[PDB]
Amino acid sequence: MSKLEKFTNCYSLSKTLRFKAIPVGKTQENIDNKRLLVEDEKRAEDYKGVKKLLDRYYLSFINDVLHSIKLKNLNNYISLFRKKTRTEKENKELENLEINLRKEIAKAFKGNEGYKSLFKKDIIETILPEFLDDKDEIALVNSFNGFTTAFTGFFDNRENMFSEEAKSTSIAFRCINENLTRYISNMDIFEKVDAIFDKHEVQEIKEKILNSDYDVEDFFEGEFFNFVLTQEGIDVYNAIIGGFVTESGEKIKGLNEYINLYNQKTKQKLPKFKPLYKQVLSDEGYTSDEEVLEVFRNTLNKNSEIFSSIKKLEKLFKNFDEYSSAGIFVKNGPAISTISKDIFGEWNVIRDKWNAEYDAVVTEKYEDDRRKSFKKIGSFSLEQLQEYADADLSVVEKLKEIIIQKVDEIYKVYGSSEKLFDADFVLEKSLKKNDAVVAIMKDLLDSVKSFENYIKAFFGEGKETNRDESFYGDFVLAYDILLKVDHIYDAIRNYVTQKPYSKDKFKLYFQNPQFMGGWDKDKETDYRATILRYGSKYYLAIMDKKYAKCLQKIDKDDVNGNYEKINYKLLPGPNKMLPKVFFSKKWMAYYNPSEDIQKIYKNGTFKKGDMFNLNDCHKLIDFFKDSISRYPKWSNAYDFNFSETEKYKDIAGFYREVEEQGYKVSFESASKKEVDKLVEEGKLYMFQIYNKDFSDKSHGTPNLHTMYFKLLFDENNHGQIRLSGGAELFMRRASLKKEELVVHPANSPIANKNPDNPKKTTTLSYDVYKDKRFSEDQYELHIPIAINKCPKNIFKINTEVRVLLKHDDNPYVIGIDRGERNLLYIVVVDGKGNIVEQYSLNEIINNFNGIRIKTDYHSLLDKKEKERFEARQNWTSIENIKELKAGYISQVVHKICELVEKYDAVIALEDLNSGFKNSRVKVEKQVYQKFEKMLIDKLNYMVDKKSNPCATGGALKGYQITNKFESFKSMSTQNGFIFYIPAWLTSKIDPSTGFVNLLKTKYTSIADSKKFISSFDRIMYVPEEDLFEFALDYKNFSRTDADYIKKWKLYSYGNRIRIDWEEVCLTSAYKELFNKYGINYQQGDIRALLCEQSDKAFYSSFMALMSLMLQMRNSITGRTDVDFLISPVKNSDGIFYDSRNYEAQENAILPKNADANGAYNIARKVLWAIGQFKKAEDEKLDKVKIAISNKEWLEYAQTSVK
RNA sequence: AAUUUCUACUAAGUGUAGAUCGCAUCCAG
DNA sequence: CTGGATGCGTAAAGGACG
DNA sequence: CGTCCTTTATT
Ligand SMILES: [Mg+2]
């Protein structure tokens, strides 16, 4: 009984193995003399070119077929599409109609005579040259005759367009699922908005745009859709909506603009047309220090056009008073928070002064319709914002001082940069070497980018009642010039942040269009590439075109050394292969196949479905079984051993046995003397398939991919991992010069970087070079493998994880959470919620031999954040930090995998589509998304390198506890062993009681502060404890639906940390507050006395004292020692929860700090969901919904503690 | 600071530890 | 540019060409 | 013929 070991051999998946290919002997010499690499480097260039010309014809072919087309179902479909109350049968109707619509478009394409030619040899030899009218381009296409097969891959990518399936890549799908669906929505909107378009306004568009061949109304009748299948039609349709610009240049207004005026001017909100997407084929970064520099000077010198539009926006905003403050608007969003702060000094005072009208009891259904109508508003006028501005304070004047301040900042930064704009300037050093220069370009770009990103607030997305077009005329003119800095900012950053070496490579073919197609022994002379072994070394051996068969003559050499030559036999895809061979002109003539059998095949009775006869299919199988035996190229390759034919449920049952039997990999001896001569003579080329684990100097643990690669040829690997074909060989030209490499000169000591390494220094007898691998041309070889090609353990992984979980008695849960002090914190939990382990992942501990050496990745991040502060916020340090986090998580994966294996444990992770990230946490959402993706990926085939490959857990019996990754949005609910959970109420919650603080203690009014103090059942001093007790029933406060217990007794126990920061003893600070106002707190219930008091500074000291008692988390920033979590509520046994009582302990039973509490409670939510699985019938486990609500959660946390 | 590649390294001396699905294509803001 | 999605990860029939 | 490039078959 293990959950894990039920999950081996579940599904098949592809991986690519990558290797340096090192030439051997004369190989590189012979390759240089024959000038082969040049030919390839050119070919790749020319190939990209021809693909574009090919596309040109493809694009012409598509318009021909789309123009012609006339869709049949249309009206009928649109109508059913529109029905808002469809019986399920009617939704199936609607699908069949949508399928038929797509099949119409597909059949329109594939039914040409022209179609089969597009992806055959013919398109390059004859069609494209006739089509083209340039002599150069025709020469390019001509260069590829006898090399058509190299286009197959591209051909497959273009085929996806002509599909009828509902797939992103399809033309049908783009027409029927995306563009038709929009057209229909626009019809809907049109009949609502039809009348407002002025009689005159419409006739404009029919002449200026439509050219008087169709009426504007035509474009909103269903039956007229066919017109907008083509990119041309779409260009028209979108022009009607967006507006056009004629040959003359006269602006012509579009329907969507007219609507904008009407809804603006009458303070209304009618809807607007969506434009149609483009059709599927219709129509880069900076490459050198000089090009980057040149752009910086040309777009941003003092007489560039962007600088001109700054000078104009200075004059416009200097004249801010001269304009109407009721027709100037500020878009709603982040810019409202910012501009609120800029002029009041307060983020949420502008929030308040429209809360001043809207604002007293708060049911959350009224609080959402509160908080939502809020978000509905589009913008605010300078008049409305002055309606909020207390008298004596001019909103327009202080805005003028802020905007004008930002342009003086730009001009000041221009004078510090002036020498970069001299026509006389030349660059001393490379930019990545020249920090001075880049920081000069950054500083200017920033100040321009902040001015730009600030000013952008003055839009209002309007859609806006009468706008000061005297202001927006000059503003829009000049802002559209200013927004060009955006592109220029990105591309110049992306450049400085790039690496100094390039990975640019190109594909080698060795003059063979199907080069290295597959490893099959028979196809070995066609592909001209095979694999050799000698001892622990593996080589790629490539026959030269003029000596294809040169390896076929070589015999085993008894006396001398021998190579091992691979002997590989694959039957690829019996469902594809078995028919082609046995119904081929060649074989069909040899083997009379009865009219039954060809009927069965032509008819399709063997294929499951309604046409299926188990007997017909059974007869086809014995046809295939005899032919295979009459076909000795298979029957003698694979010792075939089929199941008795009566036992097959379907054809796929037989095929699956062929597929698994039809793979064999062995080795043959081949004379090492004879093969080496071939290489010298230039008849064979030889590369060692190499990575660092094959070095004579390597010791200790190989890369996982080395192990996979070796296991391919191991006799304990029985198909678990197949060597696939379609490997590629590439040359990556060097991108660095040895002389310009950083060298650590031999025999001088080098300073070690890791503070936790005892050894502070290493001295080597040899030189070591930074980025050495890129100072040299490198061959790289990519080998695709096939894991679990024939899976036996077929079941839906999640349903199986739910069954095992339900019937598992003590299910363990690894909870992972992101901390502020801790990059990641781990809490392992048992089936009853006892903390088994709990620790931080700030330090990664690497083990080699019996030694351990830890690397504190929290120290590393802290030092790279300091280095970010020094040198402003340099572009690169941001990247270094991004990459460092990116590598951190790949250490963490290993640890999580260990925990899974050790505890047979499910994983509880944060759902990143629902929750809200606090940004106190170091590992931002983006990086964590990457981590959850990596985790899914590893667990498709989770292996322990250090295990025996044949053991479960090993490289041949990898655990498959995760379904193949799809999309970030799909990282929700559950994926096998990984459960995604909302982080709500996982941190700030008493792990000992389930208590959370559902009170709002923000002070507003003296009256509000009274109703609060009266809503408590009791407020008293307790002398025998020296504590103030605040008994409540959450019934009496608003927004407390989620709590389950409801009646709590708060105490002012222990201290808190107010936020600079002061420690506050709670008990004595209440005494202090009450004594300040002559309140006798010892007199039983005190609630009347506090409400008797009439001083507002009493209530705000009290609400602040309530805030502190309910702030369970207390933290001092920079002080990693002080992250304590302390409860105001007593548990079953009348003890308060204080986290520090457990951080002390070595094996604690409750969370040791705030971060620990986070992880713990995320793992408990999974425990709740396992609770649900145990409540459900086995058959209905699929149906159980995992998403735990706040209401369900608080119930679980408040009842499970006991 | 060496790498199929990436991060962290120097890990006891040309390397250590973990990770590592390639290639092509299309579509989106 | 980076996530979304597509597809290939093949031996053997078949043909052009000298 | 041979040899090299192209095309084929799909649960
Ligand atoms: Mg290693």
XYZ file of N, CA, C and O (backbone and C1' of nucleotides) and ligand atoms in Angstrom, chain A residues 692-693 698-703 945, chain B residues 15-18, ligand 1:
65
model
N 29.242 17.144 -20.235
C 30.305 17.060 -19.229
C 30.323 15.744 -18.468
O 31.376 15.360 -17.967
N 29.206 15.031 -18.371
C 29.264 13.786 -17.622
C 30.065 12.714 -18.341
O 30.327 11.674 -17.741
N 34.998 13.389 -14.997
C 33.752 13.468 -14.252
C 33.709 12.332 -13.240
O 34.308 11.274 -13.435
N 33.016 12.584 -12.138
C 32.862 11.705 -10.989
C 31.607 12.171 -10.276
O 31.333 13.367 -10.193
N 30.842 11.256 -9.771
C 29.615 11.682 -9.137
C 28.533 12.043 -10.151
O 28.695 11.945 -11.374
N 27.419 12.531 -9.606
C 26.114 12.183 -10.158
C 25.845 12.831 -11.515
O 25.955 14.071 -11.667
N 25.469 12.028 -12.509
C 25.207 12.537 -13.855
C 23.930 13.352 -13.906
O 23.034 13.197 -13.069
N 23.844 14.206 -14.932
C 22.560 14.783 -15.321
C 21.506 13.688 -15.548
O 21.818 12.574 -15.991
N 17.157 10.345 -9.597
C 18.376 9.943 -10.303
C 19.139 8.883 -9.537
O 19.584 7.879 -10.108
P 35.631 18.503 -17.163
O 35.157 17.533 -16.005
C 34.091 17.901 -15.148
C 34.546 18.137 -13.731
C 33.418 18.282 -12.726
O 32.967 17.037 -12.226
C 34.833 20.138 -12.546
P 31.396 16.791 -12.025
O 31.035 17.612 -10.698
C 31.595 17.269 -9.441
C 30.857 17.929 -8.297
C 29.351 17.756 -8.305
O 28.925 16.586 -7.649
C 29.872 20.038 -8.077
P 27.549 15.925 -8.120
O 26.478 17.026 -7.684
C 25.990 17.084 -6.360
C 24.820 18.032 -6.241
C 23.666 17.855 -7.218
O 22.759 16.854 -6.816
C 24.254 20.126 -7.106
P 22.052 15.923 -7.912
O 20.790 16.766 -8.337
C 19.798 17.076 -7.387
C 19.058 18.325 -7.776
C 18.328 18.302 -9.104
O 17.122 17.554 -9.107
C 19.494 20.325 -8.906
Mg 26.807 16.190 -12.116
